[PDB]
Amino acid sequence: DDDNTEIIKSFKNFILEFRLDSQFIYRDQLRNNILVKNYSLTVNMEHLIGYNEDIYKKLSDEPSDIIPLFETAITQVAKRISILSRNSLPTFQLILNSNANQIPLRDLDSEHVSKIVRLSGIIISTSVLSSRATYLSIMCRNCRHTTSITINNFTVSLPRSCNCGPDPYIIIHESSKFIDQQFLKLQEIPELVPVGEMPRNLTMTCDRYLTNKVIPGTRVTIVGIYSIYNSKNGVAIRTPYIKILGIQSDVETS
Amino acid sequence: ISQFSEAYNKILRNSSSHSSCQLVIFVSCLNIDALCATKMLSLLFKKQLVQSQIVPIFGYSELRRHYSQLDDNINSLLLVGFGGVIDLEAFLEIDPQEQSFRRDIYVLDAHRPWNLDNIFGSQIIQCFDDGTVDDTLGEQKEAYYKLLELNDLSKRKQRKKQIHEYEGVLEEYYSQGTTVVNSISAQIYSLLSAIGETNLSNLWLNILGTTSLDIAYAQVYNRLYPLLQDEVKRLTPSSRNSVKTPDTLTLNIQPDYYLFLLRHSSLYDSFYYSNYVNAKLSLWNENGKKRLHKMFARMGIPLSTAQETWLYMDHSIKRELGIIFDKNLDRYGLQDIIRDGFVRTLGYRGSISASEFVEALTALLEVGNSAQKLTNLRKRWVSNFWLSWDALDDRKVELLNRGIQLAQDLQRAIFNTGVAILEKKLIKHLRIYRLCVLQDGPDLDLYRNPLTLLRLGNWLIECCAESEDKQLLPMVLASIDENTDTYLVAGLTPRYPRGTKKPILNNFSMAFQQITAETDAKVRIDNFESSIIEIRREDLSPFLEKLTLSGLL
């Protein structure tokens, strides 16, 4: 994966060299974020597209295969800032909020699936937190293979190879690093465009530092990727959800 | 009538002092050219650290309040865009004080013809007539040396016959249309290059200046490109990028478009509001609106992708932006769109088209801000001037965008209302000339400013005539909200469809002065421009009838 090296080098070069005249907005965004122990970063796409058109050309192409190489790309930077040597430092979440063009809820039909979509709606109720996993160790029921699986985002079955089989892998919960998740569910705004019909509600998964960021009932504008999950209820009929990166409430709202 | 460098050394010798200096440069007035000029002028002063007073004058009548009130130690004065038409020697008076007169008022103007009393009989000037109309201009030359100071009965009759002989041809002169020869900025740069400053943002000020007026003609500007492009060739930030780099990082040539706000707005909205295209494609019509979409069907650009902001459109469409237009636009008669333009890139912020910047400043001038009310309003415009002055600065970009979010909105107003007119076919073809009046409309607050009606008037005289046979006929507009029936009425000039044979010399300046000299019914030349005047609804109708006849054209 020299290509991922090529992409991550461009992301480092985007964080370290970026200049708004003359402070480095991101690089200081980083420091001032690790000190308060926020462990997050908010990219402003306009600066991004200003810097290179290219990396935004790919980031609006296949977001879910790229964005995590951006996460690892930035946490590899906080290693050189927040500490120095010659731990532990979670891979930061990035929250990107940008103008673009508002795409109303009714107008989401396929065709933009896995392409970043900014939109606007009133949140109905927030689902109770539950943890997904980030880094979990796994041992085999027989050969006892000790495997540290780095699970990324954005479901993923466990590897069967070190009889043995079919799936002899146990989750060690004593060493496993966990994050959080939310599930907002948002009803589009009553002004537009209900017409004569009840307004649809797309299910959204916030995670890590955006979680509990928003009280249910407050208007917001979400950004996030658009994507689909299975959830047996045929055929095939997969149902739609919006991953959120990252959320920004309306003015102010505090 | 002087060397620019030498007029400069003069304004140098009378300047320095203590408690210096003193000079007040008058920036005037509402014309973006003024800013363009006086900003590079003011930067030039700051270079030698010469103290200055800079005044935002609106009204031509307003200048009298200033010059007559506060002057004490000021031996060297500078003025911009005023006096080319009406002479200030009679208007201010002057009253010669102390040859080698103590105060030198420099008057910079692009307007023609110069006042007769100005250039000859040196008192307050020190004229800026150089070098555009020198000329001769033998018509003003014989106007004085003959006139001044001017068997015996036949010599008296001969003499008087000669006097009227000169007075006739003289009457031909100074009664004429007011038309800008060259942008005052350009000349300030010609003055600036002799001193030796090549500064980049300076040059950008020149580009701004030249491109201030392309909304209205060129006229010479079509040949100003050498005088700019060569200068762009006289410097360069780097031989090759070296992306970006974060500094210098400067202006460059790109295939720019008369298309409106391409870079800071969504593409479809950028055609739909553009001024040149609102004409040829009949966009006020629902039947023509579709023809746009057919354009997009020809380009293969999605409608949804047209609705999206220009920063974020796909890269392929960007690389094909200079091709697809060639492939398609030719077929719609829209082939004149692509200019060779100037674009300054600030890098990581974005880039800005020379023209769009001017759209930002104009946007700033009217928004984003019985005699007491008009004075207070003109005052609000005076304050607003500086809000617009600030946007020129590089170090603050944060408010420049506050201009652009306005520049969009204004069009969304202007276009809208503009269409509100063509639905009712409010155009009166009359006989001698075309004329209109807005009796009612939404949000006349935007239309208070002279320049707003300059742009609406512009999009309308552009819309009515493609051309569009026959006979480009100048247009008239009027609007009223408050200030008790002020009913502002601005003169306009016809637009040729890129094939321009003659300047055509707006005649409303003369036609209005003929009426001020007749019954003068609530006629007010208070606005600095000869084309734009004020009226009352009581006296507007007899004024319109007296406008119809006698027609001077």
Side-chain angles (χ1 to χ4, degrees), chain A residues 20 46 51 53 57 100-101, chain B residues 307 309 312 314-315 348-349:
Chain A
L20 177 63
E46 284 90 5
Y51 175 66
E53 199 260 6
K57 176 59 180 181
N101 194 19
Chain B
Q307 302 286 334
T309 292
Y312 299 166
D314 293 335
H315 188 43
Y348 307 104
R349 282 189 191 64

Side-chain angles (χ1 to χ4, degrees), chain B residues 364-398:
Chain B
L364 286 179
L365 298 177
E366 47 263 35
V367 68
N369 63 332
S370 181
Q372 185 61 55
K373 309 184 54 64
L374 72 95
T375 50
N376 184 24
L377 185 149
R378 295 175 174 185
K379 194 171 66 63
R380 184 183 59 91
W381 290 347
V382 167
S383 300
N384 200 16
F385 178 102
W386 292 110
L387 190 138
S388 178
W389 168 269
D390 184 1
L392 177 63
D393 302 358
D394 307 337
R395 62 182 51 187
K396 313 179 185 56
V397 198
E398 310 174 0

Side-chain angles (χ1 to χ4, degrees), chain B residues 246-301:
Chain B
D247 291 337
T248 53
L249 177 63
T250 67
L251 62 80
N252 215 11
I253 52 100
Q254 295 176 355
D256 301 340
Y257 303 134
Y258 302 94
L259 188 147
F260 178 74
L261 284 186
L262 193 139
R263 296 158 179 278
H264 309 158
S265 61
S266 55
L267 200 53
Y268 175 82
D269 294 325
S270 178
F271 280 92
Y272 178 78
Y273 292 121
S274 284
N275 193 17
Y276 163 81
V277 160
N278 220 57
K280 183 154 292 290
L281 309 189
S282 288
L283 294 171
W284 63 97
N285 284 327
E286 306 165 353
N287 289 336
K289 177 190 299 291
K290 300 286 288 180
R291 195 175 154 92
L292 196 61
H293 305 105
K294 179 197 296 178
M295 299 176 52
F296 285 132
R298 285 294 170 95
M299 300 166 184
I301 306 175

Side-chain angles (χ1 to χ4, degrees), chain A residues 7-238:
Chain A
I7 293 181
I8 284 169
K9 286 312 174 63
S10 178
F11 286 152
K12 279 187 196 154
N13 288 340
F14 164 90
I15 288 183
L16 303 189
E17 289 300 310
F18 180 70
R19 181 171 309 98
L20 177 63
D21 267 355
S22 64
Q23 75 284 26
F24 306 168
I25 301 194
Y26 286 146
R27 196 162 172 185
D28 271 27
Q29 178 61 31
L30 209 39
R31 164 170 75 101
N32 295 317
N33 270 132
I34 62 102
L35 286 186
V36 191
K37 278 160 198 172
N38 202 219
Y39 300 86
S40 178
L41 197 162
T42 63
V43 198
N44 209 357
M45 301 308 272
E46 284 90 5
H47 301 154
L48 188 147
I49 184 68
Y51 175 66
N52 197 343
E53 199 260 6
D54 187 34
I55 71 181
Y56 179 75
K57 176 59 180 181
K58 60 192 54 178
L59 186 50
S60 178
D61 210 3
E62 283 307 316
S64 309
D65 293 337
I66 296 187
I67 294 169
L69 300 168
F70 191 73
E71 281 176 25
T72 72
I74 67 97
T75 189
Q76 283 294 336
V77 171
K79 295 301 177 47
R80 292 181 295 103
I81 287 185
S82 306
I83 72 185
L84 177 299
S85 61
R86 183 179 59 180
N87 180 38
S88 53
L89 197 149
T91 294
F92 297 155
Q93 175 202 4
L94 62 80
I95 311 152
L96 55 81
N97 63 347
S98 284
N99 206 343
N101 194 19
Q102 184 180 188
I103 302 172
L105 202 55
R106 305 285 301 161
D107 268 6
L108 303 173
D109 188 272
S110 169
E111 294 284 349
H112 37 64
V113 177
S114 75
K115 288 187 185 67
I116 315 160
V117 158
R118 161 166 208 274
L119 61 100
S120 90
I122 286 183
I123 305 196
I124 306 178
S125 62
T126 63
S127 182
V128 171
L129 319 176
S130 64
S131 40
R132 287 161 67 204
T134 284
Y135 169 71
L136 46 72
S137 185
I138 274 177
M139 76 181 283
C140 186
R141 289 191 163 85
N142 309 318
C143 46
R144 191 176 289 163
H145 193 180
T146 75
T147 76
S148 52
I149 281 189
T150 55
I151 190 64
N152 287 336
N153 313 286
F154 296 162
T155 296
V156 183
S157 48
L158 276 51
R160 45 204 50 105
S161 67
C162 289
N163 293 331
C164 296
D167 55 350
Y169 293 70
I170 294 169
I171 323 168
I172 296 175
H173 307 254
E174 65 183 349
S175 65
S176 306
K177 269 194 301 303
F178 287 12
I179 67 188
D180 198 18
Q181 184 185 200
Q182 182 74 75
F183 305 89
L184 291 45
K185 201 178 294 178
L186 62 80
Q187 186 173 355
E188 62 176 347
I189 61 171
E191 199 264 337
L192 60 82
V193 194
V195 201
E197 286 182 359
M198 187 70 60
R200 293 182 183 174
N201 51 346
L202 294 201
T203 283
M204 295 163 149
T205 75
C206 290
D207 70 293
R208 278 207 284 285
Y209 295 107
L210 314 167
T211 55
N212 289 337
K213 195 176 296 290
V214 167
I215 285 94
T218 56
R219 174 199 307 264
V220 296
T221 77
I222 294 169
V223 182
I225 310 189
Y226 181 81
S227 178
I228 323 287
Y229 69 91
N230 295 268
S231 87
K232 62 172 184 304
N233 49 31
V235 44
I237 310 189
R238 318 185 165 186

